[PDB]
Design a protein around this ligand. Sequence first.
Ligand code: HEM
Ligand SMILES: O=C(O)CCCCCCCn1ccnc1
Length: 463
Amino acid sequence: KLPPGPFPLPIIGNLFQLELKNIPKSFTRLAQRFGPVFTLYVGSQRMVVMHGYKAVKEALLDYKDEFSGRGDLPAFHAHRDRGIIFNNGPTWKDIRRFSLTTLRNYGMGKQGNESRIQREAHFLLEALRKTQGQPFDPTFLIGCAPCNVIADILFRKHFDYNDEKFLRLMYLFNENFHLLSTPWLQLYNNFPSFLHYLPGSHRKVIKNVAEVKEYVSERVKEHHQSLDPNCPRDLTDCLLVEMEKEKHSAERLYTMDGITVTVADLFFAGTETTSTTLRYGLLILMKYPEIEEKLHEEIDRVIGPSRIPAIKDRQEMPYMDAVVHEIQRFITLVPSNLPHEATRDTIFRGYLIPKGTVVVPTLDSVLYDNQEFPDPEKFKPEHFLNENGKFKYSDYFKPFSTGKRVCAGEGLARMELFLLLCAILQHFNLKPLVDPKDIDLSPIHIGFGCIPPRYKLCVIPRS
Ligand code: HEM
Ligand SMILES: O=C(O)CCCCCCCn1ccnc1
């Protein structure tokens, strides 16, 4: 017996019960009608949506084994069943297992990411300085930092904030996230064979995915050409090393394609997600001026004017620590989560979930619990502060999801936001170009991710 659901039309299924512009909003209205677990047929496909903390958690942590599958995202067939993000493949477990070790290896003990992030701050602040308190779009300035840090681990490379290619990768990272959040792409996601060869912006999305693979494609070969196993420069090498080690083995768990993808997945997950979060925060901060002033006091007090931020200071900085969370909690960046598939026929609660069913654990439903985070719509740092002004942890804070497939880099991301935000304000004040009262923090698009509005701003030195 399948989970409860709406009746489905022939061919199109349950598409009338969905607003492509706000799929998440749609799930939520459905949750009311049918509760926490419900069945939906979108196009041909069958999916189950879990809404709410209790339900979403069970699936994620209780059927970690049962639900480790990954739904199909067509714009991304070019990466499918390869790399780590997109495989419902047998190669996923190990590639994921290994990439993590390597990702972790670089971050904790090579002095770590902190060293890496800290050095980037120097560049970031410089570029910001170069603006000289005049209005600019932060999209391609701010984002440089997340991308470079990522670049080092992956390719031990370091772009200048001005080379064309760098910006292009970025421009492409932005364009895809943007497109992936719009109505046409949502339909394409579920009616691909149908729509694929018609003109659409689905085509631009696909081209970029390719340009990005190709750029990453070459850098891998470049790595091979110069590859010294004895000393491995970066994540990409370690990947090579592993491949050669197992070459005369007949059945392969690494291919060049496989590495290029895996590297790509990390390249933009690693880049775009953080840049978007950073950009949203600056806008949020500009709306509530008083929250910024409060922050500013702690940094100066705790860290001083010059000393660069470092994580030892998080314990000592309760308002930042909270602000950093609430931004993640408030913006609900990947709301419908990233899709899961049921590995084997499974029973959830009382229901049967078939193999190949698409299981959705929806974060935005978790992060807006109106019981956990009262006035969930509102940005309040005191969501994460207790009455004594100290930080308060929440089991409900899952921007990165949880379980078997939890975002691969929950650490880099978190560390980046704090140190990076924490720097920005050490040294600058943010000035909006319009009255603060007039900002709209609502996302412009909602699909894969929730996309913030375009804005320009001025940053005013503090020296
Ligand atoms: C900006 C902060 C980020 C947020 C809020 C975020 C969010 C997420 C979410 C919700 C998932 C889905 C997990 C699931 O299906 O249950 C995911 C997966 C993933 N993330 Fe992130 N992400 C962020 C940044 C990053 C960064 C910096 C990296 C750098 C390596 C990264 C790499 C990955 C990868 C490879 C996956 C695939 C999960 C898998 O199936 O193994 N992400 N992320
Ligand atoms: O088309 C491209 O190549 C760029 C797409 C950018 C995707 C946003 C990352 C969401 N995410 C998922 C896991 N971590 C972040």
